[PDB]
């Protein structure tokens, strides 16, 4: 009929500033169009379309986009990929992300799921048509999803299959929880245990719904690279690593929580298998708006901090979206 599932280069839009010092401003300066001040969304009357968060190429577009952003800004002084080294100019540039709309070129339209309790896979019955998505800060991190968009209705548990154990669990929060990360004038990061623990017992309520009233137990990450055992994230150009053993406390104790981070300059790359080293009053205040978890006897289930596939960080924002191409007929 009208429109079909399509794969086309998506252009980007930005409310950026060309003169800015923040470096994302130089990947949006002359790569993203000014954000349209009079957009249009159109309701598609008596129409149901089926979305699939886990299999859409807007995710892939965005990942290679952010890999490019990350390469040109903050090129590391020495990649290794063990088998051929590359030392290069590693100038110190400013850094912290800013939102970027993705947009169809003419002849295509973004279909938007408007069911607030859509989980990620299957039928949506309140479908809309848009030119550009909402703003999406390109931030890469593990275990916790920062500066993201909140679930507008009830807390959601996004997954491919909850019967499969491999597939990640994205919990999408209802209301955000802040997190201060400072390197005191070798670092730490504090959070208000009160609201955070309330929000968390909420998440185990919703989990209980999906795992019929069973016993929900958080546990630290098993093992492996430091970037999956720890809340690792690039904060204003410097890479933090905060031990999140505390936040997932199975005996919560409801006063301000402190976490011990390490700033590292030699890290494991996410662009592709390898390791990077970057040149050498810094603090990040951040809305925590989602969690990544992997489902691990008794009637107890064990949930452990996940992350690592940075695609999931994009899935969390782009589940409500499907590119389609308008067919003109009559």
């Amino acid at each position: 009929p009208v429109w079909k599932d399509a794969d086309t280069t998506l252009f980007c839009a930005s409310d950026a500033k060309a003169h800015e010092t923040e470096v994302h401003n130089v990947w949006a300066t002359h790569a993203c169009v000014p954000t349209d001040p009079n957009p249009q969304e159109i309701h598609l009357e008596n129409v149901t379309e089926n979305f699939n968060m886990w299999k859409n190429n807007m995710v892939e577009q965005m990942q290679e986009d952010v890999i490019s952003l990350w390469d040109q800004s903050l090129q590391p002084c020495v990649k290794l990929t063990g088998g051929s080294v590359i030392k290069q100019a590693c100038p110190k540039i400013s850094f912290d992300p800013i939102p970027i709309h993705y947009c169809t070129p003419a002849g295509y339209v973004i279909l938007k799921c408007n069911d607030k309790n859509f989980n990620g896979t299957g039928p949506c019955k309140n479908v809309s048509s848009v030119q550009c998505t909402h703003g999406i800060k390109p931030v890469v991190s593990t275990q916790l999803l920062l500066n993201g968009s909140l679930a507008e209705e009830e807390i959601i548990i996004r997954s491919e299959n909850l019967t499969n154990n491999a597939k990640t669990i994205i919990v999408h929060l209802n209301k955000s929880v802040e997190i201060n990360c400072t390197r005191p004038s070798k670092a730490y990061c504090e959070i208000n245990g009160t609201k955070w623990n309330k929000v968390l017992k909420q998440v185990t309520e919703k989990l209980k719904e999906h795992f019929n009233n069973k016993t929900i137990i958080f546990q630290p990450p098993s093992g492996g690279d430091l970037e999956i055992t720890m809340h690792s994230f690039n904060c204003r150009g410097e890479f933090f690593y905060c031990n999140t053993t505390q936040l997932f406390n199975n005996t919560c104790c409801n006063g301000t929580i402190t976490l011990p981070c390490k700033i590292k300059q030699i890290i494991n790359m996410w662009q592709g298998t390898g390791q990077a080293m970057y040149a050498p009053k810094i603090n990040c205040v951040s809305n925590i708006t989602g969690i990544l978890l992997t489902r691990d006897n008794t009637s107890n289930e064990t949930f452990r901090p996940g992350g690592g596939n940075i695609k999931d960080n994009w899935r969390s924002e782009l589940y409500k979206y499907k590119v389609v191409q308008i067919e003109p007929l009559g």
Binding site: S222, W270, T273, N309
Partner: peptide, 27 residues
């Protein structure tokens, strides 16, 4: 991820070596 390199580091922990995109996870 380097998968064959990952499996050996999870071996000592007595755990198996998944991939987490570019990152070596033990499960």
């Amino acid at each position: 991820x380097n998968l064959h390199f990952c499996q050996l580091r999870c071996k000592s922990l007595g755990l198996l070596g998944r991939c987490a995109x570019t990152y070596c996870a033990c499960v």
